[PDB]
């Protein structure tokens, strides 16, 4: 799959194993990012509804594409969307699963173990996978193609046991919702910062949405800080507000410390602020 001058490939053989190669050939500046580095994906476990597809596509690749900002994405047989983060720096590159789409399919169905709906991926815009939700016994869509639905990316930190335990529509509690919002905001802030610093902005919207994303980052960190302070956990609260990015939201942590009556936490956060003035 190629997008503009970037080329992304997947190799497999019995004597080499699964791997990927990413390159940017261009009209000039011929640089190859990674050549046949191994690919973290699970091949399918090799009834006729799946065997009609796996005789046709043995690798389990539903789709292979780039994001709207140029980050590579792959959709394996385990129905998870893997994005390659920090691919420009080969010593910091990592593959981030940003959708375990079976889990969100189970989540929108009210906890029912649902089989008759599947995700057929097409594209990834920023925080949104465009994909046809195919209903029926077949994974693939038919010729009267419906409108591709939108699936917001969620970091897979959802355990089914706790969601079944609290719900005696699956409603996520505010603690792990803040946890996934914090993680998703952090990885999306990293991706937007890398694409804006390296490739620049292709529109005018990228700086303001990065600022709002850092805002949603700090709001989720304060909601984790509150659950830390509710359990009289001073050290976890200090570790949570130590990762707080902006100086605007530290005063909110001071007010939560005032509501939780932890004056040593107030003193250490003010020492953090003292380090932050210079």
């Amino acid at each position: 799959t190629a997008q503009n001058y970037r080329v992304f490939s997947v190799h497999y053989s019995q004597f080499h194993g699964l791997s990927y190669s990413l390159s940017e050939l261009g009209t000039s500046s011929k640089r190859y990012y990674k050549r046949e580095c191994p690919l973290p994906m699970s091949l399918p476990n090799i009834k006729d509804a799946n065997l009609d597809y796996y005789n046709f596509n043995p690798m389990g690749i539903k789709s292979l594409f780039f994001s709207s900002y140029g980050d590579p994405c792959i959709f394996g047989s385990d129905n998870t969307l893997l994005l390659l983060s920090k691919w420009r720096s080969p010593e910091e590159s990592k593959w981030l699963p940003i959708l375990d789409s079976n889990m969100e399919i189970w989540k929108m169905s009210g906890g029912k173990e649902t089989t008759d709906i599947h995700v057929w991926p097409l594209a990834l815009a920023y925080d949104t996978l465009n994909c046809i939700l195919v209903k029926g016994k077949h994974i693939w869509p038919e010729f009267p193609l419906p409108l591709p639905s939108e699936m917001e990316i969620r970091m897979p930190v959802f355990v089914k046991s706790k969601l079944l335990e609290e719900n005696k529509e699956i409603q996520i509690p505010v603690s792990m919702a803040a946890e996934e919002e914090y993680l998703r905001s952090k990885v999306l802030s990293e991706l937007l910062t890398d694409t804006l610093e390296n490739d620049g902005e292709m529109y005018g919207n990228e700086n303001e949405v990065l600022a709002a994303l850092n805002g949603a980052y700090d709001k989720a960190l304060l909601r984790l800080f509150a659950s830390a302070c509710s359990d009289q956990n001073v050290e976890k609260a200090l570790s949570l507000a130590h990762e707080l990015k902006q100086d605007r939201a530290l005063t909110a942590a001071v007010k939560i410390s005032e509501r939780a009556e932890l004056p040593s936490l107030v003193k250490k956060i003010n020492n953090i602020r003292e380090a932050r003035y210079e």
Partner: protein, 241 residues
């Protein structure tokens, strides 16, 4: 656990044409179902005619300016005719209700003790229409009927007849209303609002011909007499569905 909504809400904070158009259909839907002729929103309609004039010169200037992307021009065009339809229907409905209550309006002008006047109630064009319609109807019934009747019975603003000469609007006409609460989102400043059972607040109003108090919970639709709901509609708390 720690409730964090106020500090996060105060951290989040760290005239417009669409509202004018929503107010225009609020006036239109309140006008169409009401028996009483509603007060004229003079500033809103003056702003709407100024806006439609600026859009008319804008679309004509872009037509002089005529890649060919004609879909914004089509958006301008159906924009203009749908706004013209709304303004036309509102003025036509209130002109029909002017024609229904000509004698009531001329008595209300003739009574200096009453505080309601056509300068506060009607436009200049509507005042002109009502006045010259009253004179042309007057002249038609003098040279048609009232010339041949004696001095007691040519009066058209009569009151002491066996049946009342002058038309009167149905003040207790039943109308569908949907409560919106206050126009603003801040609920506590309304003195008439009061909290009830099951969480939902209501407005309490009294029907005097039965002498009963009735509760109008926020979020539900009713049919009520117009005299009961007149003071809430003039303060713009309900919408006439």
């Amino acid at each position: 656990d720690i409730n964090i909504d106020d500090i996060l809400a105060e951290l989040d904070k760290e005239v417009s044409p669409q509202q004018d158009f929503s107010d225009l259909m609020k006036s239109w839907k309140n006008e169409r179902c009401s028996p009483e002729l509603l007060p004229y929103p003079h500033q809103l309609m003056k702003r709407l005619l100024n806006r439609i004039s600026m859009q008319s010169q804008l679309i004509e200037n872009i037509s002089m300016g005529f890649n060919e992307s004609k879909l914004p021009l089509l958006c301008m065009e159906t924009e203009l005719e749908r706004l013209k339809f709304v303004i036309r229907s509102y003025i036509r409905c209130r002109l029909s209700k002017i024609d229904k209550f000509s004698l009531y309006l001329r008595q209300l002008n003739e009574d200096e003790n009453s505080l309601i006047s056509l300068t506060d109630l009607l436009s200049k064009d509507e005042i002109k229409y009502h006045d010259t319609h009253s004179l042309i109807w007057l002249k038609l019934v003098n040279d048609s009927i009232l010339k041949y009747m004696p001095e007691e019975l040519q009066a058209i603003n009569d009151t002491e007849g066996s049946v009342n000469m002058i038309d009167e609007p149905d003040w207790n006409k039943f109308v569908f209303i949907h409560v919106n609460g206050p126009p603003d989102g801040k609920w506590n400043e309304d003195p008439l609002l009061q909290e009830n059972e099951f969480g939902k607040p209501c407005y309490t109003v009294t029907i005097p011909d039965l002498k009963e108090e009735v509760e109008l919970t926020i979020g539900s639709i009713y049919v009520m007499r117009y005299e009961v709901i007149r003071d809430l509609l003039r303060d713009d708390k309900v919408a006439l569905i």
